Symmetry: C2
Subunit: 551 residues, 2 copies
């Protein structure tokens, strides 16, 4: 029973392996029948060759290709006549046994090859030493490791590969890395010991380190069908609908910041993209991104989502970021200054390329465009007018532009929530960016440590502003989404459901667990939780109410 | 008709003065009756002395005291025998007239005294030259200036004082200072000319520069009874109530930042102090202010207001300010960080001295304590608990502490407005600090130029948050005040009245004009203006509605 119960999964229950290198010690004896001694050596030699030729071929046809070149090198050594002949001649002319004959001759090679200090000649001496050990073991009749719950002294980042990952089930508990690496990589169990070298015999274990009992072999056995159970039923929801137990439907979209995030979107079952952050196109470069370059990236995503909603956020950046082209002064409170839509409306030369590209990409999918940092109705109107201006420009140039592009704002500035009903008439949708709404509403820097205690996503104040935005959009027949981390928060989800949020958008690695929660919930019950939640005074009271309705 | 119609008031209509130095040129003649010529000189000498002795005495008994020492010096010169005798001897022995005799002898003195380069010997030569000119004028029979609408070539910061400020009514239009200074200082009119030296004769003007017409002398005459009319009826409201034409009562308090602001509070008719900023006690020093020092300053004001409400704001400061004692890190967005109540609750060693002093000072007047930057209900509760803790401490030490000290928060963080109804139960009052509420609600730095266009006090969003705070306090039987510049804004006042704000607090120099506006208004009509105002979409629409209801 050791520790280090991490690095990988749990519950293994298999045999063993013990990669401990056997005792290949021998006494330098003298032989009577040298011919027999030479045949003995030649027999171990060939046995080693068929062994290697089996290891090689059975490494490529599994999971090697490039891992199968060390064995061909191992094999090349054994074909070297300048190695074999000296051994045989020693057996004959010196009348010593094969074991020492092999060792003596191979040692000389090891000696000469390491004193060359070449990165390869030291590799050669390493191959000789490695294969010489194989023949020698055959020569002495000692069965050595080769391709169960593996267990070894150290952590070989080369030895742990020979075995077939298939039968290589269970775990691999050593004693402290090269072990904890493939531990989680092979998706197996682990459980960094020390005195594990004296556990069970060669027969044997149970990862989770228990080894055996034959009694409590049922507890962990079903505890395994509890680990795979969750992971399986979870991924099974990949295509399942996002519906509450009582039939209430919601959409679970993903937040991405690059077309490279697309694979994670599909493998998690997102129902669309609620936030396509576009800063990656502008940050880390010396020139602004061209219309054509942005077009390609918007179109790629629109098309890849096959008609699913894709909400692109126009440039949301300010002076606190590098940006060599463009000259943004220092600023005392950048989060309260010249940034996002303020910068874009003030510098249309950086905004037009983005709007033209979006407009052009709109024909390849279901595109929604949202503006960040809008504080006033006139700012939305100016942005929209500029979008319409380039719309007309694109048509007079022959380009096709989708006519039903929904325009919204990302609610983050409190004044925007205070006027929800007014914006709800001119806008097509709202998307609550709680990361910044919490910040501005609590007047606490989302990145500051000294005041992080005021960054309260569950505070009644936040819930109330979220509610008036949602209710304001529904009254005008529109919808409201959320792309702030809150939307993927297990504690917030129950509340958002009750409040009536239409679409939740989050990192792809959260949709599944979120879909699970949403299914095991009653909207009628969540609605009640939210009505009381917005009547609380503190965040703690809100939390207590959520742990209550989600017992 | 010149220009420069500023520097002072308007509408004068008086005589003239023309301080132009007369022509004191004379021809060096020869005299027959030297005795008569000496008596002539002696006659001008004595006439000058009684003239000066009159100027001296009639300078102290008016507005001089320290201005009456130049004349005694002027007089001391004329008593100097080393000056007189040489003149007389010249008249007798050289047989030349007094004019040249005086000039010649005085010149020598001027010569000798200026070549000494002393700051005083040059002052002596200046006195001689100045008084020598007086005798000489008498000697030639030339009436010179002495103590109407003054007019002169230059701007003498010494000549313009001889005349009695009483008869010195009207203005003083020169040609370009030493003129524009006392222009507004004497509260007279002005109207920086150039070719004004050739205006009206010695008889004569009308400041406002018209001079005379005897026809349009009625227009400006009543236009004067329009200037003094406003200024008079305005100060008459010093003791008048702050009531709307239809009987709605409100309080007009003052905002101060030091006991030295007290005189302006009384002379403007403030009905109390709505904001006593306490930063002055902490800024610009190397040690924190002691309890005793703060006590003295709070008590002084409490007592001086004779039972009128005095709302003290606890320390409202953050890292963006010097503050040598205390160590506040750099911070990227200080307005969104460690400051005000956040700093005080985190460093009670700086907060307790302030609360103890306030508690102690409470027995000398009607004190209200309000906390700044409160964002959460728990922050108010923690501040209150700490106040109660020192309350108990002070009583167990023998100090007296008023039991009815009202506790409130300065609403500036949006979350605070979103939860108005909750705070309205635990707090005694609210005081809207619109300077920062506008900033956080519009997410625009109150001090930043590039985004000042978003600092919109009349934006519907701001009006709505103000309204929900006021309505929330009234429902709990409490009151709401406002100390942001908005409360003293002529455009905002009509709206605040309609919204039902109980107390307006502003710089003392605004209460009068504000009281005027409030009186010439119908609350029932203002209430209607506000209901529509909170239904607008833009600031411009709000403004248009105010110019409409205040035609």
């Amino acid at each position: 029973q050791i520790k280090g119960i991490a690095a990988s999964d749990g519950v293994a229950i298999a045999k063993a392996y013990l990669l401990v290198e056997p005792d290949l010690s021998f006494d330098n004896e003298s032989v009577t029948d040298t011919d027999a001694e030479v045949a003995k050596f030649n027999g171990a030699l060939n046995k080693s060759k068929v062994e290697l030729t089996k290891i090689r071929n059975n490494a490529e046809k599994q999971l090697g290709a490039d891992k199968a070149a060390i064995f061909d090198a191992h094999l090349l050594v054994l074909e070297d006549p300048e190695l074999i002949q000296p051994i045989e001649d020693k057996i004959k002319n010196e009348s010593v046994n094969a074991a020492q004959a092999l060792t003596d001759v191979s040692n000389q090679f090891i000696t000469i090859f390491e004193s060359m200090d070449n990165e390869y000649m030291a590799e050669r001496a390493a191959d000789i030493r490695d294969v010489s050990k194989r023949v020698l073991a055959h020569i002495l009749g000692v069965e050595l490791p080769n391709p169960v719950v593996i267990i070894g002294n150290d952590l070989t980042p080369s030895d742990t590969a020979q075995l077939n990952k298939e039968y290589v089930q269970g775990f691999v508990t050593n004693i402290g890395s090269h072990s904890a690496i493939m531990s989680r990589s092979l998706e197996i169990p682990a459980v960094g010991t020390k005195s594990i070298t004296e556990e069970v015999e060669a027969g044997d274990i149970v990862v989770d380190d228990v080894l055996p009992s034959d009694e409590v072999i049922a507890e962990y056995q079903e505890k395994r069908e509890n680990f795979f159970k969750d992971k399986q039923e979870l991924q099974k929801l990949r295509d399942a609908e996002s519906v509450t137990a009582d039939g209430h439907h919601v959409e679970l979209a993903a937040n991405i910041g690059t077309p490279n995030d697309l694979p994670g979107v599909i493998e998690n079952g997102a129902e669309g993209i609620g936030l396509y952050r576009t800063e990656f196109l502008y940050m880390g470069r010396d020139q602004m991104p061209t219309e054509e370059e942005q077009f390609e990236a918007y179109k790629a995503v629109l098309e890849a989502m096959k008609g699913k909603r894709v909400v692109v956020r126009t440039l949301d950046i300010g002076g606190d970021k590098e940006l060599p082209y463009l000259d943004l002064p220092e600023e005392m409170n950048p989060f309260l200054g010249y940034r996002a839509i303020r910068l874009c409306l003030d510098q249309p030369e950086i905004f037009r390329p983005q709007l033209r590209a979006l407009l052009r990409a709109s024909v390849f999918g279901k595109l929604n465009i949202m503006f960040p940092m809008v504080a006033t109705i006139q700012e939305f109107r100016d942005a929209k007018a500029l979008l319409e201006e380039e719309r007309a420009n694109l048509k007079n140039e022959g380009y096709e532009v989708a006519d039903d592009i929904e325009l919204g704002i990302m609610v983050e500035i409190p004044s925007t929530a205070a006027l929800a009903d007014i914006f709800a008439k001119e806008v097509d949708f709202f998307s609550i960016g709680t990361n910044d709404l919490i910040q501005y509403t609590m007047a606490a820097d989302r990145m500051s440590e000294r005041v992080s205690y005021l960054y309260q996503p569950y505070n009644p104040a936040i819930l109330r502003l979220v509610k008036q935005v949602i209710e304001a959009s529904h009254a005008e027949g529109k919808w409201t989404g959320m792309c702030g981390e809150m939307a993927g928060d297990q504690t917030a989800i129950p509340l958002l459901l009750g409040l009536g949020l239409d679409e939740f958008s989050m990192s792809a690695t959260s949709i599944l667990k979120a879909r699970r929660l949403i299914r095991s919930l009653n909207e009628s019950e969540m609605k009640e939780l939210s009505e009381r939640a917005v009547q609380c005074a503190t965040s703690e009271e809100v939390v207590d109410l959520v742990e209550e309705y989600t017992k």
